[PDB]
Amino acid sequence: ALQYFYFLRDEKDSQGENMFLRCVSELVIESREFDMILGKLENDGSRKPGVIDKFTSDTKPIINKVASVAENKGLFEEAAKLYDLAKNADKVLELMNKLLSPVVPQISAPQSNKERLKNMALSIAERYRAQGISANK
Amino acid sequence: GDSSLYIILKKLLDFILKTGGGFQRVRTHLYGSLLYYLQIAQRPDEPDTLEAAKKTMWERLTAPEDVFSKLQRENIAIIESYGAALMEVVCRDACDGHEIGRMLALALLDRIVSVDKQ
Numbered sequence: 259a260l261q262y263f264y265f266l267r268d269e270k271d272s273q274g275e276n277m278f279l280r281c282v283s284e285l286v287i288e289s290r291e292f293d294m295i296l297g298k299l300e301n302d303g304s305r306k307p308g309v310i311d312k313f314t315s316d317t318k319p320i321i322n323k324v325a326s327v328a329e330n331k332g333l334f335e336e337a338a339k340l341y342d343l344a345k346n347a348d349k350v351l352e353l354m355n356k357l358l359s360p361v362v363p364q365i366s367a368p369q370s371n372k373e374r375l376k377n378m379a380l381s382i383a384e385r386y387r388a389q390g391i392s393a394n395k
Numbered sequence: 396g397d398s399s400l401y402i403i404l405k406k407l408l409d410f411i412l413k414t415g416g417g418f419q420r421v422r423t424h425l426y427g428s429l430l431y432y433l434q435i436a437q438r439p440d441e442p443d444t445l446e447a448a449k450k451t452m453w454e455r456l457t458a459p460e461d462v463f464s465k466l467q468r469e470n471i472a473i474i475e476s477y478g479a480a481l482m483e484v485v486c487r488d489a490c491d492g493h494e495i496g497r498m499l500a501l502a503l504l505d506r507i508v509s510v511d512k513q
Contacts, residue, residue: 330446332461334454341456353456360455375455 259285260295260309282310283320287327292336296321297343302389305343318344338378347392354382397435404432405473412480419488423496426485426503433506436466471511 263285266278286295296317297305311317325340334357341350358379369376386393407425416422440463451459489500 326450327446328453329450330443330448332449332452332454332459334452334456334459337450337453338456350456352458353454356457356459357455359458 259289260313264313279316283323286310286320286324290336292324292339292343296324296340298339300342300385335378347386348394351382351386351393354379397432400432400435401469403428404470407432408473408477408481411484412477414484414488419491419493419496422488423493423499426496426499430499430503430506433470433503433510436470437463437510467510474507474511 260282263278263281266274266281286292289295293308295308295310297308297311299306305311321340321344325337325344328334328337328340334353338350338353338357341353357375361375407429410416411422411425411429414422416425445464448461448464452461485500485504489497493500
C-alpha cells in the first residue's frame with residue numbers, strides 16, 4: 259500500500275503532496291501496522307526504519323497522533339511502542355511503570371520466564387538506562 | 396467519592412424489585428434517587444473522555460487511571476441482577492399509577508439507559 263501511495267507524489271505540486279501525506283497518515287491509523295510502517299527497536303542505533311521512513315519525513319508528528327489515539331483506546335504496548343519511536347523516553351518508562359505495576363498486584367500463577375510486560379520491562383531498562391538516560395531519576 | 400451514595404443505590408434497587416410500598420409515592424422516591432445517582436456518576440462527559448481513558452490504559456504504560464470506567468462497571472453489575480426483577484416492576488407500574496410517579500420513572504428509565512445501553 260505504501261508503495262502505491264507514494265506514486266501520488268509523482269504528480270508534483272502541493273495539494274497532491276498533502277493528499278499523499280494524508281493517505282499515508284490514514285494508512286498508519288486504523289491499519290495499526292506500526293512496526294512495519296513506522297519502525298522498531300532501538301538497541302541504541304535509533305530506529306530501524308519502517309517502510310515509510312525509507313520514503314521519509316513527517317513521521318514524528320504522525321507518531322504523536324497515533325500514540326495519543328492509542329491512549330484513547332488504551333492500547334497500551336502500542337503507546338509504549340509509539341513513544342519509543344517518538345523518543346519520549348521519560349514517557350515510555352512512566353507508561354511502562356504503570357503497565358508493570360498493575361499485573362504485579364493480583365493473584366499468583368504466572369510469569370513464564372520469556373515474554374510480556376515484565377519482559378518488556380527488562381528490555382527497556384537494559385536498553386535505555388545504560389545509555390545517556392534522559393529519564394527522571 | 397460517591398461511594399457512600401452507592402449503598403443507597405443498592406437499597407433503592409432492592410426496594411423497587413420487592414415492589415413493597417403500597418405507595419407508588421414511595422417508588423417515585425426510589426426512582427428519583429436512582430435517577431440522580433446514575434446522572435451523578437457520569438458527570439457530563441462524552442466519547443472523547445472514554446477514548447482518552449482507553450489510550451492511557453495503553454497500555455499501562457505507567458500508572459493509569461480507569462476510575463470512571465470501573466465505577467460504571469460496578470453500577471451496571473448491580474443493576475443487572477436486580478434488573479430483571481425490577482424491569483418488570485418498573486414497566487408495569489409505569490403505566491398506571493402513577494401518571495404521576497411517571498414523571499419520575501420515565502426519567503429513571505432514560506438515565507439508566509444510557510449506561511447500561513448497551
